[PDB]
Amino acid sequence: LTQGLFRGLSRQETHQQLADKKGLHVVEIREECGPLPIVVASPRGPLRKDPEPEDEVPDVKLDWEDVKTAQGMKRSVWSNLKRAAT
Amino acid sequence: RKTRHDPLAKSKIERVNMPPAVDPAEFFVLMERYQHYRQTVRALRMEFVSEVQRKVHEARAGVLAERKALKDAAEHR
Amino acid sequence: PYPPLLRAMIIAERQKNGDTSTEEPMLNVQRIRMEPWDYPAKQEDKGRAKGTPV
Amino acid sequence: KKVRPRLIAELARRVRALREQLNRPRDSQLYAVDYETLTRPFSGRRLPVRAW
Amino acid sequence: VPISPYKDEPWKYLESEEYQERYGSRPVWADYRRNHKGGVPPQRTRKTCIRRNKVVGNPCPICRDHKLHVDFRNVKLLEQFVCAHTGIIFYAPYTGVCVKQHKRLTQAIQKARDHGLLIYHIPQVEPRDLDFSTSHGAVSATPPAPTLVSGDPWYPWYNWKQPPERELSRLRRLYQGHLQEESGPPPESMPKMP
Amino acid sequence: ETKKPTFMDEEVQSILTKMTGLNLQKTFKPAIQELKPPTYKLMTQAQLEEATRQAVEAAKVRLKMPPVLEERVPINDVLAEDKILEGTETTKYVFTDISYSIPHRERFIVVREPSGTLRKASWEERDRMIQVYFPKEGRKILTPIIFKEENLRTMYSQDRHVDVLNLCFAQFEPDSTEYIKVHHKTYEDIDKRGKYDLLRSTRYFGGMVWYFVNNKKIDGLLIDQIQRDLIDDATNLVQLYHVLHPDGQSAQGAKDQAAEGINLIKVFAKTEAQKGAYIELTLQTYQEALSRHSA
Amino acid sequence: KAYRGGHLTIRLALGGCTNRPFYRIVAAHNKCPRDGRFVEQLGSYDPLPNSHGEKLVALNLDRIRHWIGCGAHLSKPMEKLLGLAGFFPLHPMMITNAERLRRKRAREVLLASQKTDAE
Amino acid sequence: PMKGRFPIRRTLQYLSQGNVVFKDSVKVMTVNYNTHGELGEGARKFVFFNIPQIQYKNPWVQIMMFKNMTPSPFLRFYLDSGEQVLVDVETKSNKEIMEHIRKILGKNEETLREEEEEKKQLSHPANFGPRKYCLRECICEVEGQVPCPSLVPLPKEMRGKYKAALKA
Ligand code: FES
Ligand SMILES: [Zn+2]
Structure with a gap:
């Protein structure tokens, strides 16, 4: 758990790299700020003039634990329990 | 409450409910108020009954209901 | 007459639809024939005591 | 979903209806009145006090 | 006996040097931990830390210091029990306060928001009505009925009308021996007890 | 003949919309509420312009100035008087027609008093009854205590004038007696303390300009606009003032001199403005600074 | 459920805790329980x-007129609430009980006066 | 992870993204598609993505599929009047088929709002009852009205215990 946590926390891609890798703007959308688009990172190099091809459905492997929670099916008497400040 | 097959009580065998005393004036006056009240409420009931027929007949054979079935059928063709 | 509130709601539809009139709403109580309480009813639609002698 | 027939409830129903039509009480029995106790011997029910 | 001197002005204790030397810049509940079995604690904290003028072993942040007064004017202490990012009052197990003080904090926090002392998110709602005309009879004037202008009842039968003698005679005959004294016309207005 | 523009006229709304301005950072300020993790989208230069263009369309729908109405007239209408029911009851009944498909201003709410009088419910009673059967988020049956003079001042001291107006809009109706008094107090304090900027880029700015122009108290607002390099807004305010008051000294003077732009402020400053001297000094300084930038 | 005979009635369904009565006007079957199943509120x-x-x-006049036309x-209590509102005429017994109360209060003022007068 | 390719299809969010609500006429829907060939590619993607969305919105409409029965793919709807609607979907993408059947046999946005507004009149805010059906259970939850005795004890003058003792 310790050797795996540092491995995943060091191999995470930032918003600046994502922009540089794809030469596009990384925009942050927040419900509290409504539809306003917040630019968190922009590429230092040539900004691409063509948008990413939109995909009707994405072939991304999902997690049943997350899908089961969003559909209101994960019954557990131990989740979201009142605990102390951490 | 009791049923039809339950025997009657033995304390009520010899019970006679005497009707209340009648005041000639109030009773006569009270018999006319009911006479008029019920005639005024029967007319309103008929009115309320007449509005339920219209609405029912204004939805299946109405002018605004037969004018939309042709619009929906004309757009289908 | 109509009772006070109903009369007030019948005069507000008129003015909402735009109809302007000074006539009173009135109920036709000529149809309702109020018969006495001691008027002979129908004995040919009335029931009979069951055969349970006591 | 095939209801098991109940024949005794139909046999009795016909018999009870038939008896009500052959043993029916007459007007002389139903509407007799004892004029001293003011009760209907058939049912033993007192009349109302305003009719006495 | 503990007689806190900031009872009347509780906000002066948080801006003193005794508070900074004990708590500093962190909240009063930063260094509090509950004692329980397991890793998962009970969903409710103890009802109260003071029973008949006796404090328990491990008092909560509000009960261990007698100079901390839960009042609606002490906004600096009530901000430590409200999230600064979501504006939600934390539940008891979070801070460790007892039900009695957490029930007193919520009441003090809702009273500081009703007095304009505590800042809270106020949304921009929409109008209740799409129209604003006040010409309808429901909120306007209705043509007075004739009976109302003549000082008469809506219906005639409302008023008492004396019945004829011949008809009362029928009733008397109809109900012999089971009668009550005839009633005269009632007074026009209800009497009052002087 | 000659009708004076109202608050909802296209010519006036366009002027008050421009004065209000549009600031996305202030219009879509991060609300303090339950939060969710944000979503990220890889956008191009053109996709970012269209996303910001949709925010300007939603901010103009969120800045829609609420209509300004006049104090509603009390409801004193008796439907029936039944003297036979006098003394038979101690408390009064309040009947409400809870039919769904009916506007709340066409709903019948009557009161049968202990004297047998069947009257119509008053405005204060109507609004209360509609919140009991048709509750609206933000509104309370019992008038809150924040709208008291002492509590309101506390809020004014924290520069929370936009919060007082939002609470009033969610508790009282535009044509109430409490919605007009609570608004005017907020506007009056703004003029005294010169806090006009707070209501800028909101839906309560147009209503604040409509109260000063009609009560002739635009000297403070005009000065603030001049001190923020906003001559365009400053000149449209005098033009608006003229329109509402055609038979005024400034309006007549303008036509005579055909004053335009900055000239209007000068003509108005002398003839009508209460603070004529201060406006000229403030306007003077601005003009001098502008010349340096042009050089 | 099917009842032999019966009909619909606009009555009052008692609710609330002890010493705190709250009625909720409902249209329900005659044979159904007071606070049981209802067609509409x-x-x-x-x-x-x-x-x-x-x-x-609270009165849903629109729906009360529909069920009265069906x-x-x-019920007597519901017929007296509509007379107070003005939807129906004042129930005869509301007028007769008001007259009885007047005679009653006029009979007690005599005794009170006599006492203060005679004594 | 979630088994199968494109597991997002087996989600309530994706099944409710369909905007094709058939009318009352549409009773039976038949899909004839070819497993192989370039021309039939759209129909294969229509059966892989969109068919679940249509059956979720139209659960009482029969949807039957037939493989390699004809040289070209096509859709055919059977109305309740006896009319058959042929829809040649060859040389077409799945998005075109979904937008084509929504125009000839699907409902618009005006007809759908009306249906939803009819369900808002079934839940009256004034009505009192259980949380499942109504917002409030009693009128003791309304500020101003007498509170429930459980939370606030009523005065001794409003209780029938003392009234009886007081009377006698
Ligand atoms: S729930 Fe309303 S009184 Fe107990
Ligand atoms: Zn404690």
């Missing part, structure tokens, strides 16, 4: 006076 009545001193009576009866 047409309003509410709060007998206890509120802080302002008034009794709240064959629904009215």
Whole structure:
């Protein structure tokens, strides 16, 4: 758990790299700020003039634990329990 | 409450409910108020009954209901 | 007459639809024939005591 | 979903209806009145006090 | 006996040097931990830390210091029990306060928001009505009925009308021996007890 | 003949919309509420312009100035008087027609008093009854205590004038007696303390300009606009003032001199403005600074 | 459920805790329980006076006129709430009980006067 | 992870993204598609993505599929009047088929709002009852009205215990 946590926390891609890798703007959308688009990172190099091809459905492997929670099916008497400040 | 097959009580065998005393004036006056009240409420009931027929007949054979079935059928063709 | 509130709601539809009139709403109580309480009813639609002698 | 027939409830129903039509009480029995106790011997029910 | 001197002005204790030397810049509940079995604690904290003028072993942040007064004017202490990012009052197990003080904090926090002392998110709602005309009879004037202008009842039968003698005679005959004294016309207005 | 523009006229709304301005950072300020993790989208230069263009369309729908109405007239209408029911009851009944498909201003709410009088419910009673059967988020049956003079001042001291107006809009109706008094107090304090900027880029700015122009108290607002390099807004305010008051000294003077732009402020400053001297000094300084930038 | 005979009635369904009565106007079958199954809820009545001193009576006039035109009866308490509102005429017994109360109070003023007069 | 390719299809969010609500006429829907060939590619993607969305919105409409029965793919709807609607979907993408059947046999946005507004009149805010059906259970939850005795004890003058003792 310790050797795996540092491995995943060091191999995470930032918003600046994502922009540089794809030469596009990384925009942050927040419900509290409504539809306003917040630019968190922009590429230092040539900004691409063509948008990413939109995909009707994405072939991304999902997690049943997350899908089961969003559909209101994960019954557990131990989740979201009142605990102390951490 | 009791049923039809339950025997009657033995304390009520010899019970006679005497009707209340009648005041000639109030009773006569009270018999006319009911006479008029019920005639005024029967007319309103008929009115309320007449509005339920219209609405029912204004939805299946109405002018605004037969004018939309042709619009929906004309757009289908 | 109509009772006070109903009369007030019948005069507000008129003015909402735009109809302007000074006539009173009135109920036709000529149809309702109020018969006495001691008027002979129908004995040919009335029931009979069951055969349970006591 | 095939209801098991109940024949005794139909046999009795016909018999009870038939008896009500052959043993029916007459007007002389139903509407007799004892004029001293003011009760209907058939049912033993007192009349109302305003009719006495 | 503990007689806190900031009872009347509780906000002066948080801006003193005794508070900074004990708590500093962190909240009063930063260094509090509950004692329980397991890793998962009970969903409710103890009802109260003071029973008949006796404090328990491990008092909560509000009960261990007698100079901390839960009042609606002490906004600096009530901000430590409200999230600064979501504006939600934390539940008891979070801070460790007892039900009695957490029930007193919520009441003090809702009273500081009703007095304009505590800042809270106020949304921009929409109008209740799409129209604003006040010409309808429901909120306007209705043509007075004739009976109302003549000082008469809506219906005639409302008023008492004396019945004829011949008809009362029928009733008397109809109900012999089971009668009550005839009633005269009632007074026009209800009497009052002087 | 000659009708004076109202608050909802296209010519006036366009002027008050421009004065209000549009600031996305202030219009879509991060609300303090339950939060969710944000979503990220890889956008191009053109996709970012269209996303910001949709925010300007939603901010103009969120800045829609609420209509300004006049104090509603009390409801004193008796439907029936039944003297036979006098003394038979101690408390009064309040009947409400809870039919769904009916506007709340066409709903019948009557009161049968202990004297047998069947009257119509008053405005204060109507609004209360509609919140009991048709509750609206933000509104309370019992008038809150924040709208008291002492509590309101506390809020004014924290520069929370936009919060007082939002609470009033969610508790009282535009044509109430409490919605007009609570608004005017907020506007009056703004003029005294010169806090006009707070209501800028909101839906309560147009209503604040409509109260000063009609009560002739635009000297403070005009000065603030001049001190923020906003001559365009400053000149449209005098033009608006003229329109509402055609038979005024400034309006007549303008036509005579055909004053335009900055000239209007000068003509108005002398003839009508209460603070004529201060406006000229403030306007003077601005003009001098502008010349340096042009050089 | 099917009942032999019966009909619909606009009555009051008692609710609330002990010493806190709250009625909720409903259209329900005659043979159904007072607070049992109902076809529709047409309003509410709060007998206890509120802080302002008034009794709240919610009436769904639109739906009350529909069920009255479908064959629904009215209970005496519900027929007296519509007379107070002005939807129906004052129930005869509301007028007769008011006359009895007057005679009663006029009979007690004599005794009170005599006492102060005679004594 | 979630088994199968494109597991997002087996989600309530994706099944409710369909905007094709058939009318009352549409009773039976038949899909004839070819497993192989370039021309039939759209129909294969229509059966892989969109068919679940249509059956979720139209659960009482029969949807039957037939493989390699004809040289070209096509859709055919059977109305309740006896009319058959042929829809040649060859040389077409799945998005075109979904937008084509929504125009000839699907409902618009005006007809759908009306249906939803009819369900808002079934839940009256004034009505009192259980949380499942109504917002409030009693009128003791309304500020101003007499509170429930459980939370606030009523005065001794409003209780029938003392009234009886007081009377006698
Ligand atoms: S729930 Fe309303 S009184 Fe107990
Ligand atoms: Zn404690």
